[PDB]
Design a protein around this ligand. Structure first.
Ligand SMILES: CN(C)c1ccc2nc3ccc(N(C)C)cc3[s+]c2c1
Length: 109
């Protein structure tokens, strides 16, 4: 049980990268409860987004979320070197449970 994400994605500096997160009607599509995490290897994960498109304070305006049907997405716009990292989604899935995505390695061209 794991949400589907592309293994990797790339973009040029200044451009954008979009990470999808696909589940089912009982998780991604059933709730507004998608989170996104950014992790550099061997560093703690950052919370980028919760509840599809809510930013904790401190996350720049260039990070946004969208959802339609059973797919949520994170876009990192205005790409910076700083943004190269693995990105993970998760969703509530009912029954007090969460499910996580497989992660996407983002690189800059
Ligand atoms: C019983 N235990 C400790 C917990 C732990 C975390 C939880 N998180 C949720 C988050 C979202 C939500 N929604 C219905 C969207 C439902 C829940 S229930 C829930 C139960």
């Amino acid at each position: 049980s794991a949400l589907t994400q592309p293994p990797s994605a790339s973009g040029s500096l200044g451009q954008s990268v979009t990470i999808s997160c696909t589940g089912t009607s009982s998780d991604v599509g059933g709730y507004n409860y998608v989170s996104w995490y950014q992790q550099h290897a061997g560093k703690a994960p950052k919370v980028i987004i919760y509840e599809v498109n809510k930013r904790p304070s401190g996350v720049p305006d260039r990070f946004s979320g969208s959802k339609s049907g059973n797919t949520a997405s994170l876009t990192v716009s205005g790409l910076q070197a700083e943004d190269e990292a693995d990105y993970y989604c998760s969703s509530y899935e009912g029954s007090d449970n969460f499910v996580f995505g497989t992660g996407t390695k983002v690189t800059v061209l």
